[PDB]
Amino acid sequence: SSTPPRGVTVVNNFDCKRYLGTWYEIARFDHRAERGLEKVTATYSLRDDGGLNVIFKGYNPDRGMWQQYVGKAYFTGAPTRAALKVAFFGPFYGGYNVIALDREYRHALVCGPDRDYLWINSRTPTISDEVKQEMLAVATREGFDVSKFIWVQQPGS
């Protein structure tokens, strides 16, 4: 689970300090923990031990309650390789991998331990229909089924 899916391109010149702060979840492959969740964000802070603090937050409109999970992420290798180990609970599935990132660290394709786990994340709550198409193109190219994507309710969607 803490090895990446066979074949995928993990980002190999990663600078963790440019990745820190708030990411909005644009799309997800759905599972139990995230089902029905709106306004999903993830926040990242750098720890002294070289890991990341990860705070995941989502709103369930039906009951009107927030759901929050707090985990750590550790590089499995060199911190220049975006393959990480996370816990296995809630929206953490043991492995976390950045398989595409623009030069400005504004848009990221993240996958879990196998091809049932995929996320499109942005520094902004919405992305252009263009950035959408590029992201979806990389996903298909790496053997993910884009038809699984749930487009997440976010302010301006």
Side-chain angles (χ1 to χ4, degrees), residues 16 51 54 90 102 105 120 133 147-148:
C16 185
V54 191
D102 63 320
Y105 279 58
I120 292 153
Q133 293 306 129
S147 289
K148 297 214 239 283

Side-chain angles (χ1 to χ4, degrees), residues 68-133:
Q68 178 174 327
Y69 307 88
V70 176
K72 304 193 194 74
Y74 291 101
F75 297 100
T76 62
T80 54
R81 197 191 152 78
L84 293 95
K85 180 197 187 190
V86 292
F88 211 111
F89 77 105
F92 305 122
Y93 300 100
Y96 181 111
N97 306 283
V98 185
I99 60 183
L101 204 49
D102 63 320
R103 190 170 297 94
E104 305 180 0
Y105 279 58
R106 298 202 50 258
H107 310 113
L109 191 63
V110 177
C111 73
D114 71 27
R115 287 175 167 84
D116 292 349
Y117 299 105
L118 190 60
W119 293 269
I120 292 153
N121 299 317
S122 182
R123 297 301 201 167
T124 63
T126 71
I127 61 164
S128 71
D129 264 339
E130 165 168 352
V131 168
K132 189 178 179 222
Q133 293 306 129

Side-chain angles (χ1 to χ4, degrees), residues 12-85:
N12 208 229
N13 52 356
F14 198 55
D15 174 359
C16 185
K17 291 186 208 216
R18 298 171 66 192
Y19 194 79
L20 301 183
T22 302
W23 291 83
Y24 295 91
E25 190 182 76
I26 308 301
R28 50 173 186 253
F29 296 1
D30 228 356
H31 307 270
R32 175 141 273 285
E34 291 197 86
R35 208 176 282 105
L37 288 188
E38 303 184 359
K39 311 212 289 298
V40 172
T41 64
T43 59
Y44 301 87
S45 203
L46 181 61
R47 315 162 39 77
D48 279 2
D49 68 7
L52 304 187
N53 302 135
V54 191
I55 306 169
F56 180 109
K57 281 206 268 260
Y59 182 68
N60 169 26
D62 305 330
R63 303 189 75 260
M65 318 264 323
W66 281 90
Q67 299 184 358
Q68 178 174 327
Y69 307 88
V70 176
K72 304 193 194 74
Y74 291 101
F75 297 100
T76 62
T80 54
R81 197 191 152 78
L84 293 95
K85 180 197 187 190

